[PDB]
Design a protein around this ligand. Structure first.
Ligand SMILES: Nc1ncnc2c1ncn2[C@@H]1O[C@H](COP(=O)(O)OP(=O)(O)OC[C@H]2O[C@@H](O)[C@H](O)[C@@H]2O)[C@@H](O)[C@H]1O
Ligand SMILES: Nc1ncnc2c1ncn2[C@@H]1O[C@H](COP(=O)(O)OP(=O)(O)OC[C@H]2O[C@@H](O)[C@H](O)[C@@H]2O)[C@@H](O)[C@H]1O
Lengths: 1306, 20, 89
């Protein structure tokens, strides 16, 4: 950091008045002030010495000097904030490269994307509330998204205070959000209140500045919200306006000289904006607009804004100096009388020179019906300015569109950027696609899709990684991903602490969200051009669906691969997420979106089933390689897709696989009839589908297929269960005996085979899930829980029967065992048509049956201990009192002692016989009426899993299941689901199937959106749009002067000239206030040029409009008038008397040659524009001109005036040969407009044009070989010609005049 | 919409001797 | 001048069942969350004793709307930052 504190006194300077030139007008209590009077009795920070000449009116160029700067550093405001702010005091003239290097390196500010420079009224500013509203939302909203750089004046007063407050509260209300809208303020060092505390000679790395709004006379104090501060010094003290040229010069160098990413350059776009102002504002706008930054003014705002906005669409000649002060004094009605005529003519000149350049200006218009934003104005003010500034620029085409993404302006980007003239390739829209996605903008991604971006080519692997790196942090999924990634333990060695984000991490959280049964989606690498996965679109849909981006995922699902699995996966993920949401609004929309996706899956499935039944049957059992090797139906069962499974066709599939090999239609009793008889099946008493078995009778295979049907297996299993329980009851009843009979071991081994089958139910799963999860799921089964409870009770009772002393208890323990089997017979009526719902109902009602049982129990035991206590004495009878008391309590609960008996019996009928029954009335009416509807769908949903079990269950009865058990156990000892539920299909068959359903999807979609158009709100919206188009349709029912001469800021000479409007230009019109300074250059009293810059002496005697020897002082146009022995401009008035930097008075004759040739293609034919052709000129660029220009020289020598342009450029001896070849054609001669024109020393030219028609070998060969170019210049090159090509505008007039001689384009 | 059509119907409806 | 004028202005507007007026002037409140609660409580305490078959109903519905206003501002400021909004109650 100390490199900065060493670097600033090395680098930057600051101004110093060195001599006491005591002011005539003594200041207000500053009577000792030497025309600046900064800090002394003098204007001196040293000895106010004579310095060998006490020069009266000490020149700011000659008196004031530069000194190394030490006043830099950091700052904090005393108690007003807590953060620190950087600040630098800087010289008046400083190279902007220095300041840019400072702000980049030693302050740590990266390159921006947008530069808004806001300007307005400082001390006397008043605003209506409507104007105040735009600053709070419009400026902050457009600043905060793009990552702007708000640059403004640093002051606590007026508009800068409004920007300072409106950016502060955003930082507080952001709730610890990352990033701050960076703000840089620039003010003059002279008009600072307490800056004497700021000057520290060493590096003031801490500092304290206390603001005080009391001592503000001439000066003003800083604002406390700006994040960086720049203080331009001038050496003066109370001057206002030494910050405008530095800000304007710096803004351009930042915008157009720093970003060159893949090409020549790319300019960061830049907008100046105004609210309300005065004389500082007009000078700022006028100095800005000459540098190419556009300016938007806001209507209905203030004084200067309205007087600019009224004169917007007016022609330039129509401005009258009367009209200016007329419109001025009404809006400036407070200080309207404070205006003088010189101020009126200055403001008229400035408003004239501003509204000339109609490209670089826009009005906001204050449309005030929507009062939309600043953004709609700023975008058009970019686009009009960008085209005019350059036509070959490509940075604006891709840099601008991205900005147009971030404010959601699709009509603008469609109409303006996507008209023509870009010639883009589609893959070039890839990065600006990406930010349209992260910012959740559906309209722009729909427009990119309709313009031709391919999703399947777009989603690379690293693109997907970057997509997951920038999730919305407000969502639940981001918090869950962070809780996983922070708890990621296997990342030991890296440069940082937080390692990375890999795809197996989000795969790992997705597997835990989705369920155990799937495989991991993304593989972990066990370690190119573009890594591409199995499908991009699934992962894109995942990214869209985790962030609840509704209309986006609704769009991108239309390009899915196999949509039926996809909508199921998204509905399951949404249901698994929305339960854990813990937000009262996110869960509801998260649920409703899943319901909509259920509807989508249902709607596509009912289409493809209605197309062809048996083919669509194959669709459900198909394993999807995409979704982690699963099929859709188990996924739907996981999602509780209650509306989906209840469709008719899927239930028909379930019934078909339920009825086994034979036909489905046989009823229930005929199944029992062929169950009773063996040889009936060989006869003609039953049905078969698959008519090969129905026609060709192979009764072994027919009986095999008959036993293969799970209805048969279910019926034989329930029959064996019935016989088992009946024989168990008979043997338990009469055959109980201490020695083991054969029958007790028989029912024991029957139960043993049953529990081996139940263990086989635990040990099957080829889907290698959690074995703990497998045992938990089987333990989550209610009937399996009752089964293992009965097993535990049986094995307790068996060893109690083993004890010969506990024969009576153990036997009756087995009695309870019989009860624990007969409840299993309630398992039957799930297969009933109607009764299964009632099983669901009682399964619901048990939940509060339990917690009502607890309260009835404690009530009845309270009444029982009361009844025991009342009507007896205290006795210690353990088995006499307690048993009789329990008998009396059961007799009560199965439903002078007269007064107490009536009290006990009335309490008994009171609380017991009334209340708790009514509690059950309310509770069971509630638990009935809450569920008395959808239970039929729940039974249809619950139908599946028993069919699943019995297809999985073998066909042997539990007396004979051991034959299967031994074979399966030895098969798994020495070494797979059925194909009717899950099967890897053939790939070419699968491709045909996928193409079929993906064809049907668009057929679904058309009628879907068609019927969705028929909701009445849509017709209301359409009618409103119709009548708005109707009301729009029924609402549908200058003087050419030397304007480059009158322009201010005489080049390379810091002087000024007088404001001259469009009225007082020529010598015919009288201008009574016309007093131009007799201005001469420093080199106006010099060598071979005429010494008549100080021609008040009689030295002015050279020839006027005649050739005074070598000085051909005679115009090509005509004879100039002479007044006071000096020539006047024949064109009019310029505003500066004298010679200037020109050689002599009158015209200074020069020749401007131009070379032209045709621009050929790769073949050699002429390249073609829309109508005309392409032209090339050879131009030069000097190292300190920063501009291309024509190689034209002053005609002070006769023939070597092109060599006076191009002795060092062209050649030495061959230059005279090409000068002999320079006999060409003349286009224009005479007076030329130029900024180096005074009223006396103007420029006249002759313009010759030489041409190459053939672009092979001829005259051009001599131009090639002769070239001795690299002498004292930077660069020369040939160049394409177009109206936007860089050059001096004066030379651009020559090219636009000489382009008609060959028919090139424009 | 009613205000729009009322503005529309308003717009379509929009379409001496000096002595002593 | 009192501690705040606007609270008493809101009281004057709310006791006379001036609906759209109090709906306007609540937008310039100081701490709106206490304010809408106070007005809903006052409306509920008044509307029971109203003894008019039309004033009580509108008096209740306005209080319900103010409940909705308080809920809507609270669910915003809680969603901005949780633990700071915890201090508000
Ligand atoms: N840099 C300044 N800081 C504070 N007050 C100023 C400044 N410059 C002028 N003033 C005061 O403002 C009063 C006039 O203000 P306006 O005319 O409303 O504003 P204007 O003079 O047009 O100033 C435009 C100001 O915007 C800034 O971007 C720029 O620094 C310029 O000074 C004058 O009395 C003057 O004392
Ligand atoms: N018609 C014009 N349009 C724009 N700029 C002009 C024009 N005429 C002159 N200038 C500018 O005025 C400045 C001074 O004019 P001259 O120096 O007389 O012009 P010239 O001799 O052609 O250029 C000399 C070159 O040498 C370098 O040292 C210096 O940077 C300058 O670019 C130059 O920087 C030039 O860019």
């Amino acid at each position: 950091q100390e490199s900065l504190s060493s670097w600033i006194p090395e680098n930057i300077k600051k101004k110093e008045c060195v001599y006491f030139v005591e002011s005539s007008k003594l200041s207000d209590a500053g009577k000792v002030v030497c025309q600046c009077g900064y800090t002394h009795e003098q204007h001196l920070e040293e000895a106010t010495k004579p310095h060998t000449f006490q020069g009266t009116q000490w020149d700011p160029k000659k008196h004031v000097q530069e000194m190394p700067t030490d006043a830099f550093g950091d700052i904090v405001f005393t108690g007003l904030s807590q953060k620190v702010k950087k600040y630098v005091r800087v010289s008046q003239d400083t190279p902007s490269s220095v300041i840019y290097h400072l702000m980049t390196q030693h302050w740590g500010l990266d390159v921006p994307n947008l530069l808004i420079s806001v300007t307005g009224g400082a001390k006397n500013f008043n605003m209506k509330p409507r104007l105040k509203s735009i600053f709070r939302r419009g400026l902050v909203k457009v600043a905060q998204t793009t990552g702007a750089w708000i640059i403004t004046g640093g002051s606590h007063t007026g508009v800068m205070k409004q920007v300072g407050e409106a950016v502060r509260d955003f930082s507080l209300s952001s709730s610890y959000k990352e990033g701050e809208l960076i703000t840089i303020g620039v003010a003059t060092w002279g008009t600072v209140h307490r800056r004497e505390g700021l000057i520290h000679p060493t590096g003031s790395f801490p500092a304290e500045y206390i603001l005080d709004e009391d001592g503000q006379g001439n000066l003003t104090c800083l604002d406390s919200n700006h994040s960086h501060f720049i203080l331009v010094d001038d050496g003066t003290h109370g001057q206002y306006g030494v910050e405008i040229p530095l800000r304007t010069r710096l803004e351009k160098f930042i915008s157009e000289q720093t970003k060159e990413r893949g090409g020549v350059a790319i300019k960061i776009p830049i907008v100046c904006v105004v609210l309300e102002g005065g004389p500082g504002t007009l000078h700022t706008i006028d100095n800005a607009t000459t540098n190419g930054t556009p300016c938007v003014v806001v209507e209905g705002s203030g004084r200067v804004a309205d007087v600019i906005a009224q004169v917007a669409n007016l022609p330039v000649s129509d401005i009258t100096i009367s009209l200016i002060q007329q419109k001025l004094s009404v809006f400036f009605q407070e200080m309207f009388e404070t205006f003088t005529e010189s101020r009126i003519v200055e403001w008229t000149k400035k408003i004239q020179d501003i509204v000339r350049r109609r490209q670089l200006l826009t009005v906001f218009r204050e449309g005030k019906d929507g009062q939309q934003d600043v953004d709609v104005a700023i975008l058009q003010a970019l686009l009009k300015a960008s085209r005019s500034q350059d036509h070959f620029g490509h940075e604006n085409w891709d840099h601008q569109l991205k900005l147009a993404v971030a404010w959601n302006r699709v009509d603008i980007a469609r109409s303006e950027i996507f008209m023509d003239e870009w010639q883009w390739k589609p893959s070039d829209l890839h990065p600006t696609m990406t930010a349209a996605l992260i910012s959740n903008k559906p309209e722009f991604v729909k427009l990119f899709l309709e313009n031709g971006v391919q999703l399947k080519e777009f989603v690379t692997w690293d693109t997907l990684l970057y997509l997951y790196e920038n999730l919305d942090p407000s969502c639940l999924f981001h918090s869950k991903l962070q809780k996983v990634l922070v708890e990621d333990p296997e990342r030991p060695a890296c440069a940082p602490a937080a390692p990375r984000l890999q795809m197996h991490h989000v795969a790992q959280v997705l597997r835990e969200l989705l369920g155990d049964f799937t495989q991991p989606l993304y593989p972990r690498p066990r370690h190119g051009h573009v890594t591409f996965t199995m499908d991009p679109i699934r992962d894109l849909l995942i990214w869209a669906i985790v962030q609840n981006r509704r209309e986006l995922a609704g769009i991108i699902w239309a390009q899915s691969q196999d949509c039926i699995a996809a909508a199921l996966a998204c509905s399951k993920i949404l249901k698994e997420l929305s339960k854990e949401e813990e937000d009262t609004d996110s869960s509801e929309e998260m649920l409703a979106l899943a319901e909509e996706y259920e509807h989508r899956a249902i709607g596509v499935f009912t289409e493809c089933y209605r197309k062809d039944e048996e083919r669509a049957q194959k669709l459900l059992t198909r394993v999807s390689e995409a979704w982690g090797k699963t099929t859709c139906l188990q996924l739907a069962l996981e999602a509780k897709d209650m509306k989906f499974v209840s469709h008719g066709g899927i239930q028909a599939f379930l019934t078909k696989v339920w009825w086994g090999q034979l036909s489905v239609d046989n009823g229930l009793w005929r199944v029992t009839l062929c169950m009773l008889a063996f040889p009936l099946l060989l006869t003609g008493l039953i049905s078969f589908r698959e008519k090969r078995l129905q026609d060709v009778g192979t009764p072994a295979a027919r009986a095999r297929a008959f036993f293969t049907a799970p209805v048969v297996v279910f019926h034989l299993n329930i029959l064996s269960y019935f016989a088992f329980l009946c024989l168990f009851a008979y043997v338990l009843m009469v055959d109980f005996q201490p020695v083991p009979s054969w029958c007790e071991c028989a029912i024991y081994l029957w139960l043993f085979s049953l529990v081996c089958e139940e263990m086989r139910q635990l040990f099957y799963d080829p889907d290698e899930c959690g074995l703990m999860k497998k045992a938990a799921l089987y333990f989550s089964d209610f009937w399996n829980k009752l089964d293992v409870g009965a097993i535990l009770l049986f094995v307790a009772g068996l060893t109690c029967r083993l004890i010969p002393a506990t024969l009576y208890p153990g036997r009756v323990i087995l009695s309870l065992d019989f009860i624990l089997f007969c409840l299993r017979l309630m398992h039957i009526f799930t297969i009933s048509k109607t009764l299964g719902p009632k099983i669901i109902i009682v399964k619901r009602m048990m939940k509060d049956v339990f917690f009502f049982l607890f309260l009835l129990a404690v009530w009845v035991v309270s009444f029982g201990v009361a009844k025991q206590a009342i009507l007896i004495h205290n006795e210690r009878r353990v088995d006499w009192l307690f048993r009789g008391a329990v008998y009396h309590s059961y007799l009560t609960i199965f439903g002078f002692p007269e007064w107490l008996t009536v009290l006990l019996l009335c309490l008994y009928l009171l609380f017991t016989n009334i209340l708790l029954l009514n509690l059950l009335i309310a509770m069971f009416n509630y638990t009935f009426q809450q569920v008395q509807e959808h239970t039929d769908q729940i039974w249809k949903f619950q139908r599946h899993d028993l069919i699943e079990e019995y297809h999985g269950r073998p066909a042997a009865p539990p007396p004979f299941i051991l034959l299967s058990h031994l074979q399966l156990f030895i098969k798994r000892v020495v070494l797979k689901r059925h194909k009717q539920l899950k099967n890897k299909l053939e790939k070419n068959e699968e491709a045909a199937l996928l193409s079929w359903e993906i064809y049907l999807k668009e057929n679904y979609l058309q009628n879907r959106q068609f019927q969705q158009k028929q909701r009445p709100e849509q017709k209301i919206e359409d009618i409103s749009n119709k009548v708005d188009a109707m009301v729009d349709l029924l609402d549908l029912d200058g003087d050419s002067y030397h304007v480059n001469a009158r322009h201010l800021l005489y080049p390379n000479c810091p002087v000024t000239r007088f404001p001259v409007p469009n009225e007082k230009v020529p010598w015919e019109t009288e201008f009574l206030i016309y007093d131009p300074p007799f201005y001469t250059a420093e080199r106006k009293d010099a060598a071979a040029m005429d010494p008549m810059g100080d021609t008040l002496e009689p030295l002015s005697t050279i020839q006027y409009n005649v050739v005074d020897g070598l000085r051909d002082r005679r115009s090509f146009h005509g004879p100039y008038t002479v007044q006071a022995g000096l020539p006047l401009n024949p064109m009019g008035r310029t505003g500066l008397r004298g010679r200037g930097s020109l050689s002599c008075f009158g015209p200074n004759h020069t020749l401007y040659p131009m070379v032209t040739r045709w621009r050929r293609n790769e073949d050699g034919a002429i390249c073609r524009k829309s109508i005309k052709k392409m032209l090339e000129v050879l131009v030069v660029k000097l190292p300190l001109s920063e501009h291309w220009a024509l190689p034209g020289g002053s005609r002070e020598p006769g023939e070597m005036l092109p060599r006076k342009l191009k002795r060092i450029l062209r050649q030495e001896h061959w230059p005279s040969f090409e000068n002999l070849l320079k006999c060409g054609m003349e286009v224009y001669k005479g007076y030329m407009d130029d900024p180096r024109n005074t009223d006396n020393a103007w420029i006249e030219t002759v313009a010759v044009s030489v041409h190459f028609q053939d672009q092979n070998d001829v005259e051009l060969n001599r131009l090639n070989s002769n070239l001795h170019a690299c002498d004292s210049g930077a660069s020369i090159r040939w160049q394409v010609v177009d109206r936007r090509i860089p050059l001096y505008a004066n030379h651009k007039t020559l090219l636009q005049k000489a382009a008609a001689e060959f028919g090139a384009h424009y």
